[model samples]
Each structure stands twice: as C-alpha cells, then as structure tokens.
Target: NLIQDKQTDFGLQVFAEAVQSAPDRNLALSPYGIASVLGMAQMGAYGATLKLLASKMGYSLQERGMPKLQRLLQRDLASEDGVEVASGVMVDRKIILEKVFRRSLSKAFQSVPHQIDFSQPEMARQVINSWTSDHTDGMISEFLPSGVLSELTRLVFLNALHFHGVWKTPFDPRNTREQLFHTVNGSAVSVPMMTTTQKFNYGEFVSKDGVDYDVIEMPYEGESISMLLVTPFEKDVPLSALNKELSSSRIHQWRQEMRKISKQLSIPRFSMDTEIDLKSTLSRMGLGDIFSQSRADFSRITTEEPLCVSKVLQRVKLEVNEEGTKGSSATAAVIYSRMAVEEITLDRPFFFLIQHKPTGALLFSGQLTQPQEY
Candidate 1:
C-alpha cells in the first residue's frame, strides 16, 4: 500500500498546483495520466534529473511492486467498462531507446515506445493523434495539435485518458432541464442540470477559516469508480479556499467521515476536454531540470546522443449524462427521511474528482466554474 499512498500524494500535489495556475476558469486534468507519462520518462532519467523525477512523482521506477502495481492497475482499473488509460514515450527515429530501458518501461507502464520521423512534423502529429484516438475509443482526437513537434525534438512523452460512466443511480433524463447556475462573481447562466433524489454518502466540512462546504459521493455503475462533488455553502466563498487546504489525508478524511443520507442532488451535464503541457506545471512543482537542455542528464538512457524530454503532454475527457449503462443491477433505494431532505445542488462553482475506489487512485480532477461543452 506504500506505492498506492505515494500515487495519491503525487496526484493531490499536481491538482493543487494546477489549480493555482488557473484560478477563475473551469479546469480539468488526469492525475493518473501525468504520473504515468512522467514515470515513463523517469526510467531513462539519471543523476540529479532522476532524483528530481522520483521526488516530484513520489515513487521511484526502481521501487518494489512498481511493475506489479502497474499490471494490477491496468488489469483492474483500466480494464473497467468505459474507461481507458494510456501513456507512451515517442522518440525520434534517429534516436534509439536502449533495450533494457524499453523493456522496463513497457513492463511497468504498459507503454510501447514509438519511433516517429520528427522531420515530418505533420505526419508525426497525425501518428500520435491516431494512436491517442484509437486508445481513447475516439473520445479524444487531435491530441497533439499542430506545431507541438519539430525535427529538433528527440523525445516526447504523452498521456491520454477517457472516461464515460453512468451513475449507479440513474438521473432521469426527463428531470434534466435548463437551470440557472450562479458564477463566482454573482452572475448566473442557464445550464442543463440533472436532478435525482436518493441515498448517497455525504458529509459537511468546515475549512480552517470556518467556511462551510458539502461533499457527496456518486458511485459509477460498477461501484469501483466514483465521482466526489464538493461545493461551498456560500456562493461568494472562493473555491480556492477549499482547494488550498486539500490533500491526500483530507480526501481520506472526507471518505471516512461521510455518512449515508437521503438527499436531493443536482449536477450540471458537462463534457470537458482538457490538454495540458506539464513543462510549466512541473517547473512550478520543482522539476525544471529535466526540461533544461544543458542541465538534463540521461546518461542511463543513452551516451551516444543528447536525449532530454522535449514535451510532456496530457489530454483528458469525461462526459456525464443521464443515460445509465445497460445491464447494471445497481438500484437506488429510498431511505425514508423524517426531516426535510438535505439538498446538495452544484449550481455554483464546485470541484470534482473521479477516483478508482479499490486503489484510491485519482483518474481525473477538475473544477467546474461554468457548465458547458469544452
């Protein structure tokens, strides 16, 4: 479980830091994707560069159970219905990946090192996009857009994930309607809100500053994956206040403290597509040496030619709708409430995370400021 703990810690730090970079807009990212691609690069890292990757990513590629955990996750979590997790290293045809490094990466990360002709940048882009689209079930297209790769680029790391899951308790499409969602600035806009009343694991928490917030967990069809929604009690309170205090321990605390309760839940029907280049974010997270052309060291990977990561990119997409998956037996049971049923409506800004329940690994995280198709 030490490896699992490290993964959660790494994910939370990335989410917290990414939030700081984009405060006012709707932000979405795949924490698992970031870790997977970075872990691949860590295989070839050496000296100070290797140490930084291990420290920031929270687990060394050499750790015991690293390969077993990767196989376990791919077999258990990634194989789940409507979920696809993938990562790979793309190297120039001119540069060769060492045999042992390639084998270790493929074993630990399920990665296939690709050899592309970076000289033909457009063709290289198409090749990467095709692989991404094929693995994501076509949910994500054009993963590496124009001008991201060049002839000088020797190595690139990429990750792409797509999730399309149904709530265990279905939201009636008839109940979905255009409702007004309040923005952080006190303005409102119409968004398609899905509504349901059922028993969900819920809790109330107060920040250090005494700002109240509510959290509810909505299990997906298999009950192995779930979405946790967090919204503030007051519309005026900035979501950053809750975000600044978030951590792996806090998430575990919320899970243990939440109680099963009957409540009315309303969430916006949202489909988000986000692509992020981790160079800046990784720099902010104390990992600038790998991207430094002069300072980077990859002697373990190759001494024949200079090999440093040119780009680290992640693309993720998640869709929430009223249509539940077919053949799922999970039913919504009504727990009679004597008092008025509590209401947790995501009508304002809120934060959400999609987690693999069994292992506690975060697959995706985002803040919903305004609900819309991205």
Candidate 2:
C-alpha cells in the first residue's frame, strides 16, 4: 500500500512537470542533457547518454539545441495543448533486474503464469484506458491506437500526467496593450503583452549577484501549489543560470523572503502543447536491448506469446494569457501486446527541478523564457 501510495503521488508531480514545460516557446533542450537522462534509463549506461542524445538531436555541449523534436511536438500542441507523458514497467516480483530501465518484452512472454485472450481490441483498449485515465487525470483517449490489444502480453506498467491553468487574478483585458519586448540582442518584438496593477501575495529578494528582484505568488483554485512571478529590477540576469538554481527549498525561501510593492507587472499571453515519441529517444538513452528485434526479452509476466512495445507517446501543454499561467501534460506507454506507463512555477527568472521523495533523484529540470528561436 505504501509503494502504491508513493507511486500515485509521484504520478501527480510528474504530470505537473509535463504540463509546466510545454508553454515556454523560446526554451530549447540541449541534446546532450536529454540524451543523458534517456541513456541512463534505456541501457543503464552512464557517462555518455547526454552526449549521445545531444548528438542525435544535433546539439553540442557548448551550444543549445534547436531540436526538430521540439518543432514536431509544438505542432501537436497546436492541435491539443493539454497532453500527457507516461512510462510503464512490468515486474514479476523479482528483485534481480531492479536496475534495468526496461524489462525484456520477450522474457515477459515466458514468465506469465496465466492464459488470457488479448486479441479483441475492446479488451486491450479497456485495460490501457483504465491505467491511462487513472494517472492522467482522466484525459486520455478512450479508443485504442489500432491493433494494440493482445492477450499474450503479461503485466502492464504506465504513467499519465495532465496540466491546465487559469490565472488566479487575471489581468484586466482593458489594461492589455501592445508593447515592445526588448531582446538581449537590443532588437525588440511588438507584441500584445498584458499588464496588471493588482495586489496579491508578493515579495522581493536580492539574488546572489545582489540584483534586487520581486516575486508575486498566485495559487491555483483548490490546489496547494501556486504560480509565482519573479520580476527583475532589469532583465540583465541570465535566465538559464537563474533557472538552474531553483528547488523547493529556494522556492520556499523566495516565498518567505519576498516583499510586496505597488508597481505594475506585464507579461505575454501565450499557450502551447508538445508531444514526443520516446522510442528513438529511449534508444538514445541506453535501453536498446528491450526495444531491439533480436534482444527484446520479457519472460517474467507471461509465458504465452511474443510481444514487443509498439510505442511510447508523451504530451505536454501550458497557457499564459492575460490571466496567470495554467496547463496539463501526460505520457502513455503502448505495449502492442499488454501495457504500461512538478510544480514548476516561475515567479522570476529562476530554475526548477522535479525529484523523487525517497531518493531525491531529479526526474525533470529546466527554465522558461519568451519565444526566441535558438
């Protein structure tokens, strides 16, 4: 029950990260960093995952990646901004392969103890949706993704995350005006950024560089978390560096140390959703055997059929209009035969990290910025 409870709570935080990362348009991932995480998960490989992922995505250590995957996901977000990302892990009550990222699909066939009919599309779809809906805030498609349900498959593991936001104290539409957003390069964009002159839970703090900054925190209705705004005295701080410094402790520090002011704040109104296929991404991460046609093994869960993973789909979305920010995201694992599957609030230019409670291992981390092509 404790394991079940912990997993359930982790699902919520993971969902939060998925949604929070979807909205910022200017930020792009370094192929190296993405590769690092994926590599460790896939092959239990270390030291080179980040380098490999970055290379696959055409990113280098010294440079930021203008990922085509980002573009692909952005297009999907355009159509469905409220997306999800999930990962599944099927176990046979064994502790031997605890370190492996993915269980062997082929081996699973040999290990399943019971026989079941998974040929009917309806049967498979029902099971998949049940898992997906439970973790994704009940936002997954009810239908199967064609030829997905199979009886031969054993156990299924999955993850689903969702995000959606409505500004706590929305900016007055009458106050929205067209203004120029200054770029670090001295050029500017004439965009319709909204402004607000309201008061809420606000504060100010000095950064490590002694730069004076202010924060305004807004809570989501019925949720313990809040959307925070960190405005700078001037936009001279490196958003990337500031973002790397974010953690729950620092966020708490900001909350306690911040002060309120009677000045006005303005921000752009934007929204987006992105979807990524982790098959290739996972391969880049290091778990290549379970996905390989020859090496795929999953004998612990079932002993009836030859099954392999068909897909791993993830989606993330966010919106920041005249109101405060809101969003959702989730990931789904499509086991062709069987199954399985963050508050990142920005108050200023700061860092964020989503981590495991017992292990303090970071699941996701990043920064947000205005739309800028890398």
Candidate 3:
C-alpha cells in the first residue's frame, strides 16, 4: 500500500519482514536502530525518485540540495529520543538519557541496573497495534495524526518505537512489602515487591577477571526464541560485561549450561515514565548532519520552503505487578512505518536474549528495570 523511492517500495516491505521476525513480543528494536535501517533504504529510493521527477520535468537538484542535506543532519542530532515525522523524515536514538540517567542515579528507583527496551510497529492495522501487544512496544498502527492516511502519499509522516524488560521470576509481591527505594542520596520510598523460588535456567561461574553470573533464559510458547539473563556473582562485577560478552556462541553456551536448581528471586514493583529528546543521542552517534533545515536533502518528498526535524521523542512506560506465581509484563512501541515499528513489555525488570531460529545468532539482547519518573 505504501510506495518508496526504491524498487522495494519505501522500506515498507522490509518493515513487515522485521515484524514477522519477532512475534513473541518480548524482543524489541530501538527506534533509532530501526530508523537507521529504514533511512538507508529511503535514501536510496529518494535518489531514484528524484531521477524519475527529472524525466518528467527536467528538474535538476545537485547544487540546490546539498546545503539542505547538511542542515537536516544538524537538526536531527539536536533532538531527543526517537521520532519519525512522515515519509521523508525520522529520528532515533539508542538511549533515552533523561530516563536512563534518572534510573541509574535515583535511589528511590529500583531499576535492574542495565535495562534494555525494544519496540516495533504493526503496519496492517495502520492504527498502532500496541493494544495487547503488551507495552507500547507493539503499537504499529497509526494512533496519531487523524485522517493522515490519505496524506501519507503526499505529506510527511512521523513515528516512535521503544521497549523495556525486567526480571522473569520477579520478587514476591508479599515480599515486596514496605522497603526503601532510593534516589540520589537520602531520597527514598516504600513499595510493594515480588519474589520467586524455582529451578530456573541460571548459573554462577568464575572467570579470571571476576565471578561470572549466568542469567535465566525464558522462552516464549514457540521455544524458537528465549530471554537470557546475566547477573554477575560478585557485587563488584562489571555490568558492562553482559553486553561485551554477548555473541552467537557465548549466548548459546550460557543457555545450554547455566541453570540453577533452587534460587531465590526478589524484585521490587515500581513504575516510571520519561519522554526523551533524540537529538543529543544522534549527535553522540555521529549523525548530526541530517537535521539542519537550511542544509537538508529531503526535496524528493516536496519542494516546500524548508522542513527540519521539527521534534523527535520516544515515551516509554513500564509496570511490574504480581498475580499468583507468574510474573506478567506490559510495554509499548510507537513507530513510523517510515522508521519501522515496535512493542514489548517488562512488568518487572529482567534480562532477555533473542535468536534467529535458523542461524542461532543473538539477534537482540536487553535488560530492563523500572522507569525513573512519571
């Protein structure tokens, strides 16, 4: 239904394929990651579309558009979070600094340290499919810009995607009873908590550098994919190792060998929401040339005066509640099929690992904790 500058049709086809790849609703893609991929494709199509327009009216851009391209990049790096505004525009950043920093520095917040959020979009619905997808991460249908469907072919579009997850066997809700949650210095509060006890897929090993902790991996109904958790044993263990050690073989080995018979799990139930501006994130990643309205290169979509990355943001919510013995999570993803889509949930903070059935590669990995502020 959507067309692109490329023969592939504006990356819409690729977006569909990406969704089918993660049906479990546990794994998610950063809006920036998804948009980066989509943008590359769009860029290709943009060039081709211009060529077609030239054939029709002898339009030549060369010197007239280079400055515009530079401005687009500059403005994009100045925004926050991940944002996709229509067909010819999109912005994505890997980290929501405001949220992450608060969660990391706040004492009252019971975040699971290095939490990773993933989000995707559902195109068939065109109305943001985040309903039961759990968390806004699964929202793909259009939930904004009413009556914009007809304008998609003419005007620009915007989208956002995000995901967050926590522990699998969350702490006992009863155990979650009054406990102090801390934020910078003396700031703290009491909140309900959840606990768990079972033979889970976890382990404890020691490496030359330090004591290595193996997290649990919970598979969805299909068993084609699993959530892997890695927690080091020693308190001083570096959390960064989790991401550094992640790889095809390391993930497989951990899943195959790391499992504990009886383990105690305690997790605090909390909630937090933060809206991020993605401009800074892109700047850190070295993509600051696309947002300068004065030097932008989006002419393929229109010849209007000038259009810059007006705004780019990603809002995420995480809730960890207890119901009986199982832990339930819910998350949300808002995407601009223009930047792809997203969804996934994390009621309680936990670790997760995803694999592509055939290749067995760790397609995605995440660690989620409670949000920082409302």
Name the best candidate (by TM-score).
1
Q: TM-score of predicted model 2?
A: 0.46
lDDT preference between candidates 2 and 3, better one: 2
User: For model 1, how does the per-residue alpha-carbon lDDT over 342-374 read when each residue is reduced to its tens digit?
Assistant: 777889888898888887778888898878646
- What TM value does model 1 have? 0.94
Writing each residue's lDDT as its tens digit, candidate 3 over 167-201 gives 33344444545544332232454545454554556
Between prediction 2 and prediction 3, the one with superior TM-score is 2
lDDT of 2 by residue, 1-374 (tens): 22222322332233233324443434322121232223222222123433443344333222233223322322332222333433344322322342223322112111112122345546656666666565455654441355543543433333333445455455666766676665544456666667665445666666676666656654444333345555555566545323322434555576577564333566655443334444553454354444443444443223344334444444334455654443321112322423220011232333223322232222333334443222
User: What lDDT score is found at residue 261 in candidate 1?
Assistant: 82
Better of 1 and 3 by TM-score: 1
Runs off by more than 4 Å, candidate 3: 1-172, 179-190, 204-213, 219-228, 236-257, 303-308, 324-374
RMSD of each: 2.0, 15.6, 18.0
Candidate 2 segments whose C-alpha is farther than 4 A from its true place: 1-162, 183-186, 206-213, 231-233, 276-313, 323-368, 371-374
Full-model lDDT, candidate 2:
0.40
Error of 2 at 49 (Å): 15
Which has the better lDDT: candidate 1, or candidate 2? Answer: 1
